Write a protein that binds this DNA or RNA. Structure first.
Lengths: 78, 90, 14, 96, 103, 73, 80, 93, 91
DNA sequence: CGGGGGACAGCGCGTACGTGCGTTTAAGCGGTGCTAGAGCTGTCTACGACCAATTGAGCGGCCTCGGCACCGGGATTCTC
DNA sequence: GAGAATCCCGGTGCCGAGGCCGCTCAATTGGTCGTAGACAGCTCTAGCACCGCTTAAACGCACGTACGCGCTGTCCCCCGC
């Protein structure tokens, strides 16, 4: 079962729905791969800091509060 | 008060030939204060989240990893470790 | 009863 | 003769990028800020260095906006800068 | 002897410690914190000063000047990311041109 | 709008890159969904503004790159 | 008249700035637009600086107050 | 009477007065400050809640919900521009 | 635990008792309350340190709120604060 | 003020995107089942805070010398 | 090909940088006291993995058109002096 979900999980129809929510009329077929990349970068940025928060708690588990801390400062800057 | 003396020390260590404009040194003096505030702010936030009364090497060590990009962070953090260990033994 | 001081645009949210 | 349009522009661009001085006229700025501040208080005996800092801040902020809007214009594939490119730039920057 | 030299560092550990207590960043400070901070500060300062020195030498100055600092930071992507919201008086801009503007 | 199972599997993959062993509260996954959706929608609104400024009905990847540079960078 | 000084930041000065911005060709409209943008930006920053100045209850504005005003605007300037 | 009721305020002046110490914000705090703080807190929440109540009422709902908050928050430019980086969980566009 | 929902309920009943509130919205209000509190407090602290002051007073917060808050909301809130502290102090 | 270039509009053509349809696929929900770590509590010891004394370094002021900037002239390089 | 602009070289001025000295304050050293943190153990719950089942969503293909792109011609404005 050869495909890997991390790219594929975010998929043309869902992207279309996001664009429609964003009021987009029409889209080039190229767009999706840009957005996946951008999404990875965005996600990558936040989760790294959540990891480091979890490290400072020395806990194995990551809470929504750690997410809130990383997302708070990172979201305001971005 | 100023860091200018230490700025000169590090400058002569890294580029003993060079001099600096006092304007540029003033830039450095503002910069070091900025980074000192930013790191202290994150240290405070971490301590508060963990209900700690105190700031330790552990707090600043982790916070640096939050301020700096990862390669600069890796150098900074390992240099800090070496420094604090040398202080511990001496 | 917790009256509002600002005078502001009226809105329809329906 | 006349140099062809743009060659002058290019060489002056290169000059102004390489140079480092303040480009806005000094006293005009000093006056301008003096007035607009006065809306908030009757009289502020400004530290001149504060005016200098404001001059630097305004220059930097404007040049940043200018390069952004130029990026917009080239994306338009025009080369003439138009106010709509400014409005777009401020919108995308979230400044509007 | 001074705590800085006991660590082997130039920056004033006593100053850092005082400033930390003055800033009341927490009720207490562990003795390792101010030395670790001084260490990372010294490292950062050296690192940036290398690039400023390089720029000055390329301008064949011996005196470093603000222009050299701006050109250094705007050359290093890491410092630039660290300093994206930071501005330098008399720093100017890093000379660059969009090639599509060229004739 | 976006699908929790794929999304969280992606999230765990990236976390696995940093830590290599994690646990997650479902509330954390929810929060990441909300954040990502909001961020993406905002970026879409920007890139649409770009596309209409270029007088296209289709958005183009160039518009994404431009929007991300101007706002994000 | 100082209102006219917002016009008194002259077209060629704006042109110089735009050349530092690297821009090749500019329409005649841009000058008033940028004058407006600058006015709004500067009015905001000075409003904050004066708020500090009056909180210190002294007639002198200082560069330090400007630094704080920028910092709370969310932007930093060195050398002071 | 209690400090809140003395001020007529509907917030825990004692908590915030304690919190002003607990957050290290200053080693001293002056008695009016927590009172003055509580007053503006009450005012601020009232303004948003009034708009959000209209939003629920307009949507024919008794329940105030994130949608109704979000609709209110984005409709006032001042709140919206004040809250321009706040994101509302389950608050639609 | 250390939460304002009861105070939210008070002012909710005081402002729109015809409206219920989702626990989600209530939590958002709690998050909102905490956010504005830490924003004003952190500013006032840093202003006090800038003024070299070990104490925070009505003036510091009155100044900070005028800094943070949009112009109308500011003077309205300022008047509410001054009224409230007047009642408190006159009592 | 004059001249040239860029901007704008309109037209044609082809491809890409959108829509419909059918089939496949995985998500969504519920239940199974367990273990890990989360959180809490209690106890003890180390570490920092506070106070006092002493010493050395840093800061401030002054002086001298060298580096940088500006101005003028000639040659090189680009542009029409 | 010719003219205008740019760069390099040399001299001089002017000030700032660097060093020295002395004094004062901060930093260092040592001791005391307490509390915060660390360590250990216990109990609870939430998190993780997989199956069962339904259904909706997603995917793939074909058909059609509309939009985007490029070309051409005219006109105005802005740039340069």
């Amino acid at each position: 079962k050869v495909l890997r979900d991390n790219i594929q999980g975010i998929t043309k129809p869902a992207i279309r729905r996001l664009a429609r929510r964003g009021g987009v009329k029409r889209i080039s077929g190229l767009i999706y791969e840009e957005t996946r990349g951008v999404l990875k970068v965005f996600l990558e940025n936040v989760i790294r800091d959540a990891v480091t928060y979890t490290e400072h708690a020395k806990r194995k588990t990551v809470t929504a509060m750690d997410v809130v801390y990383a997302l708070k400062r990172q979201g305001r800057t971005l | 008060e100023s860091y200018a003396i230490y700025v000169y020390k590090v400058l002569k260590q890294v580029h003993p030939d060079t001099g600096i404009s006092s304007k540029a040194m003033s830039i450095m003096n503002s910069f070091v204060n900025d980074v000192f505030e930013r790191i202290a702010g994150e240290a405070s936030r971490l301590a508060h989240y963990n209900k700690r009364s105190t700031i330790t090497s552990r707090e600043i060590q982790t916070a640096v990893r939050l301020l700096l990009p990862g390669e600069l962070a890796k150098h900074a953090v390992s240099e800090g470790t070496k420094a604090v260990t040398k202080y511990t033994s001496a | 009863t917790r009256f509002s001081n600002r005078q502001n645009k009226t809105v329809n949210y329906n | 003769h006349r140099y062809r349009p743009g060659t002058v522009a290019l060489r002056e661009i290169r000059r102004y990028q390489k140079s480092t001085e303040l480009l806005i006229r000094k006293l005009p700025f000093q006056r301008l800020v003096r007035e607009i501040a006065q809306d908030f208080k009757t009289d502020l005996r400004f530290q001149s260095s504060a005016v200098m800092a404001l001059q630097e801040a305004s220059e930097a902020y404007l040049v940043a906006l200018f390069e952004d809007t130029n990026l917009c214009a080239i994306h338009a594939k025009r080369v003439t800068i138009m106010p709509k490119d400014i409005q777009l730039a401020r919108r995308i920057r979230g400044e509007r | 002897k001074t705590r800085s030299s006991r660590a082997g560092l130039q920056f004033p550990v006593g100053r850092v410690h005082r400033l930390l207590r003055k800033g009341n960043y927490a009720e207490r400070v562990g003795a390792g914190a101010p030395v670790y901070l001084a260490a990372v500060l010294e490292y950062l300062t050296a690192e940036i000063l290398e690039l400023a020195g390089n720029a000055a030498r390329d301008n064949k100055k011996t005196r470093i000047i603000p222009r050299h600092l701006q050109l250094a930071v705007r050359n290093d992507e890491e410092l630039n990311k660290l300093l994206g919201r930071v501005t330098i008086a008399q720093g100017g801009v890093l000379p660059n041109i969009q090639s599509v503007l060229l004739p």
